[PDB]
Design a protein around this ligand. Structure first.
Ligand SMILES: CCCCCCCCCCCCO[C@@H]1O[C@H](CO)[C@@H](O[C@H]2O[C@H](CO)[C@@H](O)[C@H](O)[C@H]2O)[C@H](O)[C@H]1O
Lengths: 79, 417, 419, 79, 419, 79, 419, 79
């Protein structure tokens, strides 16, 4: 149920990139998140939270850090 | 007499056609800018100025379009609110499709009628190609729930925005409304005015000088030479390719800079439309530079949504095929938006195949770089040779695309029209 | 010796009142000082008199420029009589003397209206806006009768009756309100608000009078009139078209003039009464008359309708109040028709509006009593759905447009019925 | 002479209904008396107080409330 | 290629000084910046000089376009014989030097007034306002002789003498007062009062010169003149009618010009002397000259009458006060008549006003003496009721109108004398 | 030989009416001198003390008081 | 395939620089934002570029609109040969490289001034004001050579050389002074002083160019030229008249343009050097050259005179200093004549003024040494009085006017040719 | 290395005028320097010091006094 635990399980459920230790580092240079792959993770998280997050408002710097996603999902849950 | 002839008798001003149009517009827009300086808006004066300049740009040889224009706006309302009053109840995921289809119906009719029997439909007017986008954006915002409430004043001020009515930069309602409500500061307004004057100057240079040179003094004779020469290809074909492509950029950039300058004089910073496209290293970077407002619109609303809906159903097994089909469909739809002919669709699908092959090259380069790093081999350097080769091949491919989009292959070839 | 004076005051300029757009330039410049003075709580009281005189004389001196002489008589006539009544008010107060003063103070309007009916040609003592000027004078005499007004100087009188913006046919004022709005200069924020409203009214008036008015009157109206006349018969589609187009044209021209007058008065620092406030969305006749030509209808309600009700109820000549109200409505609307011009069609218009108001009052009372009985019976009240409002708006709009058809005078040409 | 006594004795007689318990209620929404019916009272006091209320400028706001009507005679007695 | 320079002068625009009201429009637009700057403590010298020069040359051109050339010489002439007397005054002051300088200063006007009467048509030196310009120069010279004025630059001299609002025929002004008024700019409230005064003067001038003057001079005067000419005889009712009509025409026209000039001067920040302050109501003829053409009459009273009394009395030529006063009055009024122009009727007008003044003085002295005689004898002095004042004003007004008949020159046409 | 006594003697040397007492009083109210009578006294002192007082600017504000003229002429004697 | 863009250039609107009063309305409306922003210590630096470009292109697009292309070359030339020096200056400072850079910078002027003499038709590089723009570029190169100038941005350059008010033929600046005046925005009192002086200059320029210059040039000059041509001979009265009138006309037109340029430059906030300061009261030749065409003469004194005398005295090629001064004067004036244009008469004018300056210097030195000898002997020096000053003024004025006759070129038609 | 003595000794070598004591006195009133004369001094600086003072802006307001000439050469060798 915990959002952080859900993210931790999700990131390694399929790819198994062992990125649990590498969390504070830049994932853009790690080859995990790019200009196109981020949508795959977004639609994956849609399969867990079942929330239709808007994509027109989704900015380039909206989800730069994982903490931004963690706080944003909780922000939209209450509203 | 009272007829369409009465409309045609009205004065006609080409939108950003002569500098005297610009002195008229500056005189008209000085009071609103000065009023906006002290953080107040006139509304009524803005509506009158916008409508008078719209009708002046529309009352040409074929002024009947104005009548059609009216129908169009009414049509949009008849459906836009028809979704708003339906939004509050429940989104069925299918009423949204019907509303979007009915909103784009004027555009699809205007793009189908010329290529079915003999002529364009009546409902066509000047800027319908760049006005359906605002309404579809509004309906998309309704579907996602980002937008909930708005008055008619805001809606019909955003949709019929005068500076970007003819063919100006394509906006979205949320950003435009948030920018229209909040007046900027004083120093920010000074910077906006200085940028507006710079844009007017650069637009003069771009459209009234360079566009004239590349379109009226070089294009006709080169086209005639290529037509007379005939054959599959020739040096005059290359000449017309380069000349037309530069003409198109130097005209569209001029118009976009004019529109941005007028918008800044109205206190709204419309999205930029050109950021030096020809310096593009790869094909993908070209579309973040060439017609960036429209390209971003298609990326946000027609590319991301398509890949999302394909991922939801899990139709395709791998990411690569999904990205490829999304790119191809997006560019094909862009070409269709231009107009349903053979060469516009060819231009769209060619940009699509270029984009997908560029993506494949980027993926291959990343894989080989990873292999080099694993094996300790130095990655391929890019200082002066690789970058120059990339920009050269990208610019040449873009110019070939502009040749196809020019429609000159219609006369050079003799393929059935 | 020879009376060629008429030719002297004919070649001088004929600047139209709110005519060409460039007019608002001239007047605008001519109003730059006064408005500035308003900001400093200083009223010039001489420069404004000069600008008022110049623009009134410019407006009047046209093809019928001889009317200027008539004006120089009419003014004097008022000054001959109004002051007379004030002297009487100092000593005594009787009804018959007041009636005589009212008759002698509104006689010029009676002559202008009644001369063409008998003689057939416009009477001499007629000018551009006499019908909207005897209202101010008879209002001042009315106020003196009730004791609201006791003292005033000729400066206030002649800057009130001859108010430059609302002169030709403009909002009909009253002395008390105008004097109070003239004495107390508004503060800075109020003046800025008035200036922005004045510019809004200027541009709206441009739209109303130069574009919409011309489109509806100089383009569609003549061919529709010709087609309707050619068709003949009692009624036909083209006369219905002329009814609708003329109604809209009349409203647009009148509203454009009213907005121009309000804008200029706001520039001069006075808030003249409004004229039109969304009249066609009116859902009922009683609600129509509070939106169509507000200045005039409110004037007749204050001075000619209410006083009629009071004098009728003083003697109790009617057993029930409803008959008194019906009679008062009919008489008030007949007097309005007479004021518009004593012919067959204006009187028909007045009588028709009076009958309409009486019918609306009867229907209102019937609805009220039906609703009361329904509530006392425990049943739900009458519906107030959007359909009811739509039907009310539609029927009121149709009746108003029929009235404007009668008032247009086109029935005098379509029907060759002179009497 | 008391204006209040005349007012209270005329209110329950001109409408044939005993509504003397309510005096401060707004007749605009009460519906007991219409907007155009106020003249019925204006003539009435003329029979009793022999003073005529001006109607040149008193429109729909000057003497709307009943208490203001009651005190109007006293106010006019000064002048 | 230009032919003669006089043709080039003729082709220039020519605006009649205070003719069409559009002249006032041009003048107001031109003088707006100067008046606006007058609120603060700064004045635009170059702008004032340029506007004065352009309006002067616009007034001076036309059919008589050579006169402007004769203007230039005139200016030099004064500067030749003003600064010469300034240099002489710096050292000494002999009577004969002052006499010669004054004679040479008024020589252009003397020639202009004497050439036509001696076997000629029109002297070259004449221009539009030479009759009202040498007054300022001879005022400078007499001020130097009295020693009141000591120093002044050329800017002040040639700005005071060529004053634009008072060039053609305006309020004759001294130099000390004008210079002191030009040095010190008035306050803000005083400037506002001046602006209101200027607007009121413009309005009254419009009433006085473009309406009443037109009525009394361009519609009634020609028929009366024709009737009197045809009738003939020594005197007739048409002659009386033309007397009254012309006298009123002259007063109204001159008052219109004077009020126009005062309004323009106030707009330029200088209070020029007032010409007319309600004439025709003076009880005695002596009070007439404190009301009719006040600037000129005061000028002659100060510089030509009082100085004559001083020179005659200090030389004890006569024996009694009465004879000295009589001869001074006669010479003063004769000189005024000469200043008008050397004909038979102008001199007749001057000497008649002189006779009226001296007989008025004699009557006043006799009335005082008889009042004292009756007081010391116990008899009541003569009453001063309304009837006495009415008969006095009637006699004075009739005598003035007779003077204006003589000054009109109509007696030259009726009698056919001196021709 | 006394200038102060000469000042008093001047006024009575011409009219011989003994107006020494009426020195500071209103001459207009007394009627002894007026706008024309006082000119003789004004010019009388010129032939004795040799003062050419400017009469060109002589308004009805300079010599309205008898005290002012004495101090003015004494001040301008040496000027 | 045609190169017809030149015709397109002739399709642009035309606007004579300071050629019509309505021009200043456009200029004031365009420059209001610059002045307002300047008031608040704010410079846009982009709106100025836009207005300068618009008005320069408007001025240049006349009948010979093709000159615009030449301008778009000239600028590109100067830049290429200005930075080419600056990049050199940091490294080395050899003299011959500086000479070559200066020659290549001034080459377009050499071509424009020498091609018509040889070829016979105006060279391509010519445009409206090239002769007044090479001065600023050579000034920049001179300043770089001296080390006064250092690194700078292209913005300052191209807003300095192409300065709009002084483009066609206006005051000649220097880079350092203009840059320091552009950077330091003046205070509010200084801005107000500039505005009042600019309005004074605008009005005075109207007077100088549109009235006096037109009168002296389009009215008297052609008839005098025709009469002088018809008379023939070496010299006569009509050519003396044409020399006088042409000298005055040249001075008035030039002063009018200079005052216009100063006014506009003040409106932009830069005080350009003056051009004329009472040149005809010069009284002496050297004092004439410090009053006639101030900017140009000062430029040649700072850069072409002083440098030449310095380099002459470095090598001490002349035994005495007086010969050095004479040679420097002659060479400077000959270079001025060349700059005016290589014909016979311009070079005659230059060498004539050089000889005049040498003669005046010799006379001045002789008078100084005579005065010194007299003081040594104790004798009083020769008087300087009104007559001596008048003699000096008259002889200098006559010599200047003869020089302007030579410079007019009319002597070429009168004396030479066959007509 | 002092420079005042060099200037003092070099002035009289050409001007033939004793300037050892007359240094602070204004040369313009004394007639020693006739405006242009200072040019002959300028080359003297180039005679031995091999430094040339700029003459682009050299007017008769900056280097008018000999003290300015003495002081400016020291600064001109560094800036
Ligand atoms: C020529 C003769 C006929 C002329 C036209 C007659 C018009 C009036 C008759 C039609 C009346 C029906 O019209 C209907 O009237 C009702 C009252 O009953 C209005 O109802 C309204 O009445 C008044 C408005 O002034 C208020 O009490 C209140 O706002 C509402 O009750 C409705 O808004 C309208 O729809």
């Amino acid at each position: 149920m915990d959002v952080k635990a859900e993210v931790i399980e999700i990131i390694d459920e399929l790819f198994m990139e062992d990125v649990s230790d590498m969390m504070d580092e830049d994932l853009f240079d790690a080859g995990v998140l790019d200009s196109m792959g981020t949508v795959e993770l977004i639609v994956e998280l849609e399969s867990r939270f079942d929330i239709r997050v808007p994509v027109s408002e989704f900015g380039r710097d909206d989800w730069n850090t994982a903490n931004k996603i963690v706080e944003g999902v909780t922000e939209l849950r209450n509203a | 007499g009272s007829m369409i002839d009465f409309l045609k008798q009205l004065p006609h001003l080409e939108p950003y056609g002569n500098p005297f149009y610009f002195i008229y517009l500056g005189i008209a827009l000085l009071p609103i800018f000065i009023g906006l300086f002290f953080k107040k808006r006139f509304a009524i004066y803005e509506c009158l100025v916008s409508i008078t300049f719209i009708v002046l740009a529309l009352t040409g040889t074929h002024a009947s379009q104005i009548l059609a224009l009216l129908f169009y706006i009414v049509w949009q309302i008849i459906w836009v609110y028809s979704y708003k009053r339906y939004r509050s109840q429940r989104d069925n995921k299918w009423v949204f499709y019907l509303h979007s289809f009915l909103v784009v119906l004027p555009l699809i009719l205007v793009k189908v009628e010329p290529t079915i029997n003999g002529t364009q439909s009546l409902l066509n007017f000047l800027g319908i190609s760049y006005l359906t986008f605002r309404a579809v954006g509004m309906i998309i915002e309704m579907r996602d729930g980002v937008l909930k409430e708005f008055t008619l004043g805001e809606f019909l001020r955003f949709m019929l925005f005068m500076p970007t009515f003819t063919s100006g930069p394509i906006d979205r309602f949320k950003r435009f409304n948030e920018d229209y409500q909040s007046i900027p500061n004083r120093d920010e307004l000074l910077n906006m005015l200085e940028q507006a004057v710079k844009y007017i100057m650069l637009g003069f240079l771009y459209k009234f000088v360079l566009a004239q040179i590349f379109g009226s003094m070089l294009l006709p004779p080169l086209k005639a030479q290529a037509l007379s020469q005939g054959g599959i290809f020739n040096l005059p074909t290359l000449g017309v390719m380069y000349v037309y492509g530069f003409d198109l950029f130097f005209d569209f950039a001029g118009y976009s800079m004019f529109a941005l300058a007028v918008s800044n004089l109205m206190g709204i910073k419309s999205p930029i439309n050109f950021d030096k496209p020809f310096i593009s290293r790869d094909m993908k970077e070209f579309w973040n530079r060439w017609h960036m407002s429209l390209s971003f619109w298609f990326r946000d609303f027609v590319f991301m949504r398509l890949v999302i809906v394909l991922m939801r159903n899990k139709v395709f097994k791998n990411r690569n095929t999904t990205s490829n089909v999304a790119y191809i469909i997006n560019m094909m739809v862009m070409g269709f938006w231009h107009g349903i002919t053979w060469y516009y669709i060819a231009y769209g699908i060619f940009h699509g195949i270029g984009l997908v092959i560029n993506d494949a090259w980027l993926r291959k380069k990343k894989t080989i770089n990873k292999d080099r790093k694993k094996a300790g081999l130095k990655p391929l350097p890019e200082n002066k040779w690789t970058k120059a080769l990339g920009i050269f091949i990208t610019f040449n491919t873009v110019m070939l695309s502009f040749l196809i989009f020019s429609g000159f292959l219609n006369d050079l070839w003799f393929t059935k029209k």
